[PDB]
Amino acid sequence: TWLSDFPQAWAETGGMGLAVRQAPLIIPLKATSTPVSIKQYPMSQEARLGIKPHIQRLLDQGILVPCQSPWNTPLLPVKKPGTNDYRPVQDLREVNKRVEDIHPTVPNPYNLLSGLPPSHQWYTVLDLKDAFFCLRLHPTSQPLFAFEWRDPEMGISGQLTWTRLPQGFKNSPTLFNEALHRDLADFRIQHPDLILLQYVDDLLLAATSELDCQQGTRALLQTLGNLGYRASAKKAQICQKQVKYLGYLLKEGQRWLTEARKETVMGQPTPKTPRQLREFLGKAGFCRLFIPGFAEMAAPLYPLTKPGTLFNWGPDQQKAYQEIKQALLTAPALGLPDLTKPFELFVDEKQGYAKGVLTQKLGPWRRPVAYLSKKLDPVAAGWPPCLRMVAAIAVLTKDAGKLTMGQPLVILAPHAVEALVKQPPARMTHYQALLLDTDRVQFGPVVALNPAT
């Protein structure tokens, strides 16, 4: 029934989108930027025949228009990982380098989920289909994105150009972020209670109760409807407690991991080549935050990553692989942090490796915010025990300076070391400034933390 109520917001019924608020935008060029023309690279018979149906339907939507421009880049098909659809890719390699650089105001995935509070339990995730195509392109800057296309079947040759912001452009996520932010800035004012989370094009609205989410949903569908943006009804988790966003599961105000992601890590067989291990370490690097002390767990596999070495899969290596497989099976539920609160950093060391959990108050309990782990730099790892803790607290607190958004936090440790920092019997002076900053750093009561949790 949701599709019926808002015909102006859904892509399956609303048709093509168009930003009716944003003006046409001129894409600037650096001093040495010149209209480089590259001939269309040879393409296979079936390949061309794969993109060809898309061009016909992209012509109907008005996305592709004939033009005569000095700029020209070779089109390139990329077949999907499954079946064969031959998606069209502009391959704007050369033009991407040359276009004037603009700062990437995009929000980093670490910090978006930090803004979600556990109080807002009802979620509604809306995808924005053809997001980059919403913004219109100025006819002065339209000649920039022309690409040579040949279609002898319909006799349509020449260089089609984009009247909207194309994909594969370096400024597209940035130009769309600011453009979308201004339109939704007025919406946030009208509904202070709702929490709107935006990642490039994906928007997530957080509300207190279910009705608020429903009411927010309806209002958002209409605000975006007037603005021209079209939302995908095929993939839109609306008024559901369990939603998936930013590759994470948001259940009961917590950050879980997708079960499909866990299967992939365990699914892979024992790696046999440095490329095989690189795929596994990078894939499981995403899930490093859920596995406390993962750095120590995946310690044996790190030296095997070096380009010059022998890939000897010893029993110790197999033991490290098995630990990660078993660790991901019973991964806990990391809670969502709360900026409007203090943090408690628990630090510990053993054998040159630093490990700890950043936590915040949730009811009477402590909820983990992130599991932080780093290796101690050689000179520090070599020190005796009761000062290796100083370096341990330092590197972990450094990681905090990326999730706490600069909010003040308290540090507790089994050994009182603040007085040692003041009078340690260059780098230490750098350590002194960071550790002694009472505005952001504080030393709490001495206590011993759980060996495992």
Add this chain to the structure above:
Amino acid sequence: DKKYSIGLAIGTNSVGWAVITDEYKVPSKKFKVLGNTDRHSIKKNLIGALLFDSGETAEATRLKRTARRRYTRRKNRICYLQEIFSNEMAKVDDSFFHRLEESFLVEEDKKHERHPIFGNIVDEVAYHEKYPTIYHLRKKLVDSTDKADLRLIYLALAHMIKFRGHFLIEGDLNPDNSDVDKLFIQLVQTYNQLFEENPINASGVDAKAILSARLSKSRRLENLIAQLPGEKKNGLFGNLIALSLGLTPNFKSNFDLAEDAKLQLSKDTYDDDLDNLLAQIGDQYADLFLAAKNLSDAILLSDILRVNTEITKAPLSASMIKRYDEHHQDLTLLKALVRQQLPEKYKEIFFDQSKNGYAGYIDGGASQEEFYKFIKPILEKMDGTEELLVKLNREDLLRKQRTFDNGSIPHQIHLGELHAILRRQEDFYPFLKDNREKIEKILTFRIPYYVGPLARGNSRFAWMTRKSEETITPWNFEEVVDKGASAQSFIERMTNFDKNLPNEKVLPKHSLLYEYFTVYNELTKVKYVTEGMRKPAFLSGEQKKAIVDLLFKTNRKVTVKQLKEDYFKKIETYHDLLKIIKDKDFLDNEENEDILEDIVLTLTLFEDREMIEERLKTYAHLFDDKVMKQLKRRRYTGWGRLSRKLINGIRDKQSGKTILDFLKSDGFANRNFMQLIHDDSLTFKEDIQKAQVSGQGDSLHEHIANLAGSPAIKKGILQTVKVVDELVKVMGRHKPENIVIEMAREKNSRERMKRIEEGIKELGSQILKEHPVENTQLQNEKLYLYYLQNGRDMYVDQELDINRLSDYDVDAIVPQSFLKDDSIDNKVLTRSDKNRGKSDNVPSEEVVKKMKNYWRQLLNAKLITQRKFDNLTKAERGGLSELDKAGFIKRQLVETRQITKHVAQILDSRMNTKYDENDKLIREVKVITLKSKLVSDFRKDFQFYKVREINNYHHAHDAYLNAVVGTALIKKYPKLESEFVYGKATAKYFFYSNIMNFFKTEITIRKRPLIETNGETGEIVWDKGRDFATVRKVLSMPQVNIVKKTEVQTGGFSKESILPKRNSDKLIARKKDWDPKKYGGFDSPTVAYSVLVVAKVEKGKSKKLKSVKELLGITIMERSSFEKNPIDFLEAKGYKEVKKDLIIKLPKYSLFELENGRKRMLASAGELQKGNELALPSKYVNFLYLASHYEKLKGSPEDNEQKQLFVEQHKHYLDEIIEQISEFSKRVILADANLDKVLSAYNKHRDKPIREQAENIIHLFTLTNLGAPAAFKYFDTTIDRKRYTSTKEVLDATLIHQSITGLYETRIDLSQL
């Protein structure tokens, strides 16, 4: 991407290469194969070598070109004579010249009568009866006074003009001077008449025998001086005798002239020198000098004419006629004697053309020496042959008129005979009266060596300039060819440019500016010390000016005492012109420096007095006639290494002062030339750099051609550059870290024979006369040393015996340990080596003192060289000092050859090209040059023994070891980069003796650590545990890419010998109209390249078209015609419907793969060569080396004993080596008869010692080798060549096109097409 290094070994006909990684492991990658075969990939190791034929010098080509020019000019001379005679010959006998041209023609081909002179048989026979030889006619024409037939006159003149004689003697010759004793007596009479105070007596002296002796001119002069009282050498009479006999004496001491005034009698300038000397002394010595000239003429003529010239005006023709008569009389006497005593050998002597004798001497090709050798025993074994034997011994028996010894006849004799003929016959022939001068000019004209070829702009060798555009004949040569400009260009085309200013020519060495520059450079570095000086001070500009003006501009040699007295006490080329022009203000003036430069340049450029005087005429008004004459007399020789623009033209930007100006006005700084050109603040360095930038560099081939060295070495260098580029491309366009390179260090019997003959003649001994030695015998080292040492010991005073040779010892003057020189200049043959004294130094002082006189005599006899003498007498100088020993030890390891430096520079410029911010080149690739001693020592120390007879893998192994050793050395010792990478006595001695001691586990006993580290860094440069195993594994790999460079043959068409007529299709016509079957011709044409042709031929009477596939040899002569029209060329040969697409060009050494890996290389269109290499195991290689005792034994007695025990325990390896050879031959060589003979010889020679068996088994690898088959010898048995003279089987094989490294291949299967 992986860091790697390239190791190279360059030979004259081989270039090995190797790519190694950090762990000294040779990589291996799959390589795609192109072509139509089913093989699409192949695995190969990055190790191999490139073999090519050695390059050649242009000496033979230059000789051939000169011969061609000479023949052309001779035909032109004959044509000029014919042009002179043409009108009168047309009046007399019109077809005479036509008959002359077609003398070389068979009867059916001539369009005139066969008899060429008179045209009828009666007249021809009568003429030949009257004049049996041309010399009879020449003498008759000279002597008779009546009319002579015009054809006879033309024949005599043509013979004289065609065969002129040598131009060694300049001036004029009077044949009337023939008696030696009479002229000597006349000279003595004139000398006594003039020098009345001290008369000279020469009675009772055999002047003829003394002066006409066969010894050297100096020896004859010494003998005459000894046998003459009242005078000795360097006296007036001695100088006169030397001048007459040909030596150049200095008459300065005779008249106290204070100038050399040397006179050479055969030189062209003798008349001018004599005129100057007479003007210096007086007019009363003209008679003495004229007598000396007549005596010289008699001396030089009597050795040739050997006949009485008082009755005839043709002494040479009379001599030839008397030779003819003696030949006839001796022939009759020999015929009669042989008939009387040995009638049974008459047939073989006077009738058998094959065997030597008279028949082979006249009709056959036997020479005079061979005839004498055959006929000496027969004459000895007869009675009444005493006078014939005397004539045989003096080499005067049965002599033809045209012989090899006729090369000593001056052209002046022929000129005199021709002049006499013309004088006799000009009364009846007015045209002979008119053209006498021009006929003589035809005879006596020769193009000057500085004029060169007379081209007109289409010759690369010519440089001549014509003042008028018209045909040059000998009569208007002076009026057409610009001799002065031609000579200047001749000199200038060869002189060097300044290296600092590549576009500027160098100054003459004796130029005034050059002299000032050298003197000022020498003077500015002298720091004077005298009283009242706190510290030494440098001379100021004004002080140097005063010193130069007061000392150098006054006396030739300036010394320190003269400087102190004439300057510090009195006050505190230039000289040659001062005594000639007698003008000081002119020489010191500054506006005439151009005139002085022009004068010295003229004297340097021109060697002919007429040229100098015609060039100096522009300055004749400045001087007087006598000054001009003296200037013409003086001549300088030499060219400097600095340009005038560099010395005085360029000026500093800041001060506007030239280099010479700065050098004069140095002041306290006193900076010399090198400091001036290397000063950063001064602009001289910047201007020099700017000039060198212009032109940049030519092509790589042009640069290598411009390099100096052997052509074979240059070819090897180019091949190495190409393989470097190819390897860089192979490895992914990644440049290597290091490139370690190394280069090998490198009729003679006729030269040795001529040298020993000259030395014996100079010394006056008769060792060669005691027992003559042939050149092949003289090629032996011991015999050559014994003969060079005059048959006497060199270390002690005693006599050696030739029959006792092969028992003495050859001792090197410099010990072999310090310097490895095996040349004759360092080798010495003595009875006992212990006579030299200590074995680790120069021969002892006592021996040097004993043999100093003998060595000096040998040096004066040119038997030993100056370097050998200096090395021998080094004990007197002080012997081998410790610093000398250290330098000798160090220079054995550090490469110092300029050719190696050039190779390193070329590779470095090619590889490293990037520049830093401060224009400093980044040394991404380090080029290291090593000597072969390091690698050879490594092999000897660590059992990597090398045997060259096994196969060609040793080139690749040498390259690999070069890379490994160089990389390890520069890793361990970064401080050695200065002496290796292109870019105290005790301490230096022991440093370079143990530079390679870090490889070995034990020293002398020092327990060196197993793992070698850099020190100051954690770098492992070596690992004795595993790196030796890696090297052994690399050396034992069976796959190594050996490539023979295919080439297209170019050069001579065929063998130069002209064969007689025979009914064979192989003969080649010498001219287009001369049929080989009737005239003879060449044979054995050289094949440029084979062409695979698929066509059809007509076979049988029906001429049916049979499909044929075959190889056609396109010889060198017909290559251009084939390339112009292949279709027509092939159709003319008989093939129809050929296929241009299927035509394949096949150069030499084209590789074919047949079956079981058997490979054949195309030797020619009808021959093949082996193309497979035997990969014998390293265990067998080491056993063969140790058993064969290569280079004798060079190990300690403890180590020597254990190696013999190793050989004894491994005796049975010989059978396995034979088994390997046999199976390789059966699989590849397929020479069944030779294999069976080899096996039979081995079986019969099984009982002989292991040493002999191994030494002879080394020879057996000649059977299984790569290249042309060769004959070898196993003990007594000799095995001939098994040549593959059939190219039929290769038509179904696979043709492989290999790149320069063999990693890129294109296999073309010829079976399909």
Add this chain to the structure above:
DNA sequence: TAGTACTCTGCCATCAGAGCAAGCACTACGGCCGATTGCTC
């Protein structure tokens, strides 16, 4: 049987000299030809 047709074996190849000029490479000696930093007056 005659006639090609391919195979194996031994012989065989142009060679001597005379000047002249320029240059390089090596030997054997006998002299002259950096720049920066630290310490001292």
Add this chain to the structure above:
DNA sequence: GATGGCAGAGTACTA
């Protein structure tokens, strides 16, 4: 000096 041409003697298959 060495390696490819050539003549000649020898043996074999075919028309």
Add this chain to the structure above:
RNA sequence: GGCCGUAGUGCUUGCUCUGAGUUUUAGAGCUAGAAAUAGCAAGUUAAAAUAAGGCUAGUCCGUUAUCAACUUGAAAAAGUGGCACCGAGUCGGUGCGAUCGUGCUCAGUCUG
């Protein structure tokens, strides 16, 4: 590494010349024998060619150097070929193969 001074050796490039050597023809072979054959006599010299030849037509040039295959070019020239590991009888087998941010590991450079 260069440039002076002396001395020597070896080699290279270019030019101008000389003497031979080779090939064909001319230099009447005679006598006794049908013929082969036999017996005697005679012999020394000359002409021409000396890379075929070419065009530019000169008293010029013609044996040095350079040259795998394929594609593009008139030509000069430029391009064309995956990597790792385990082995070794001329090489084989096995395995792998457009952008913006964020996480991890590692390298290099600069500075103090």
